[PDB]
């Protein structure tokens, strides 16, 4: 499929208890590769993916400094948002941003984004043209005027179109042995008496990467979409993902039902029965 590099910043104030907490996490596709956590006596940008050993030795020091400077401006944004929204100094509040770029499998850029949130709600976002801002309310409109006057969209667009894709391309190369080899799911079906006349068929898919997957129940080859229960995809803990799909069937009718598993790592869809 396509590829993306995604970063997420979170800033949380704590009145009475000192300085705000600041977390960065970065992802290539469904793999976390760095983190920064200000909760430490000397916080560092740190690797979270083994193929990050291949960076230049000055990388960690450089990224640690940029991270500390970013924390400082998010500390100031938490106080600024208090003034825009006319809130007291008493309560804890949250400021978040997320941004990233996307790339076709051949490495070509096609999408970049940048958004900001305050207390869990849209605050301001870069528009699809990467040349203008959308403010979510009148408080955020202060930030819209300020950032238009100072030409911030261009600097944001420059980063998302050049540096972001350039480095997404390098990281994919660094971790090709793992980021570009899909791990197919291991699928099985289980049987558990639901009612006196009915049974639950559960179709399990474990140990797959990346996270995108199709798990559907068919009865006599037709889609059973209304009557399936389907859990949100969840992490295995080892960098793999899991999902399952269930359906309730009349007893003895099991053979009517089939489970289809489409995943990037499967040459052809798996088809399973009880």
């Amino acid at each position: 499929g396509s590829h993306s590099m995604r970063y997420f910043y979170t800033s949380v104030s704590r009145p009475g208890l000192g300085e705000p907490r600041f977390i960065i996490v970065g992802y290539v596709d469904d793999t976390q590769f760095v983190r920064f956590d200000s909760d430490a006596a000397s916080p560092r940008m740190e690797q979270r993916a083994p193929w990050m050993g291949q960076v230049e030795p000055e990388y960690w020091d450089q990224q640690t400094q940029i991270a500390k400077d970013t924390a400082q401006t998010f500390r100031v944004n938490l106080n600024t948002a208090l003034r825009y929204y006319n809130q007291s100094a008493a309560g804890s509040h949250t400021f978040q941003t997320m941004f990233g770029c996307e790339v076709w499998a051949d490495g070509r850029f096609f999408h970049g984004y940048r958004q900001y949130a305050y207390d869990g709600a849209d605050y301001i976002a870069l528009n699809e043209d990467l040349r203008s801002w959308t403010a979510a309310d009148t408080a955020a409109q202060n930030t819209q005027r300020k950032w238009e006057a100072a030409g911030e969209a261009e600097r944001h667009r420059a980063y998302l179109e050049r540096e972001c894709v350039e480095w997404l391309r390098r990281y994919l190369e660094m971790g090709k042995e793992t980021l570009q080899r899909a791990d197919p799911p291991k699928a099985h079906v289980t049987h558990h008496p639901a009612s006196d006349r009915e049974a639950t068929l559960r179709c399990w898919a474990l140990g797959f990467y990346p996270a995108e997957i199709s798990l559907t129940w068919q009865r006599d080859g037709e889609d059973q979409t209304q009557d399936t229960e389907l859990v949100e995809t969840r992490p295995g803990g080892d960098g793999t993902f899991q999902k399952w799909a269930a359906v309730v069937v009349p007893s003895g009718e099991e053979q009517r039902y089939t489970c289809r598993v489409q995943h990037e790592g499967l040459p052809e869809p798996l088809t399973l029965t009880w």
Partner: protein, 100 residues
């Protein structure tokens, strides 16, 4: 502000089989704000060694985290996840069921 209550899924990393080692998982997602308290329980007792992933969030801005610990399932040991959050008036406990 916006406040969203956590979804909780408890499960094992590999399909459970008594006496073989495994990882018990408690995946909490879709919550806001981000302060949350997650205990893993063995027969209603807090398990001391527990680790978690780094705090991340989704396209709708809500946070998710994985809490996990090594364990060896037996037939009569029961495991649970206990979550506390500002949106909950009391701790939510979700029992592990090796069939989900």
């Amino acid at each position: 502000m916006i406040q969203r209550t956590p979804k909780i899924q408890v499960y094992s990393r590999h399909p459970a089989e008594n006496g073989k080692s495994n990882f018990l998982n408690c995946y909490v997602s879709g919550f806001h704000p981000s302060d949350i308290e997650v205990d893993l329980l063995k027969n209603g007792e807090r398990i001391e060694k527990v680790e978690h992933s780094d705090l991340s969030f989704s396209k709708d801005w809500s946070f998710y985290l994985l809490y996990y610990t090594e364990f060896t399932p037996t037939e009569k040991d029961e495991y649970a996840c206990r979550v506390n959050h500002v949106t909950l008036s009391q701790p939510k406990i979700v029992k592990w069921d090796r069939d989900m």
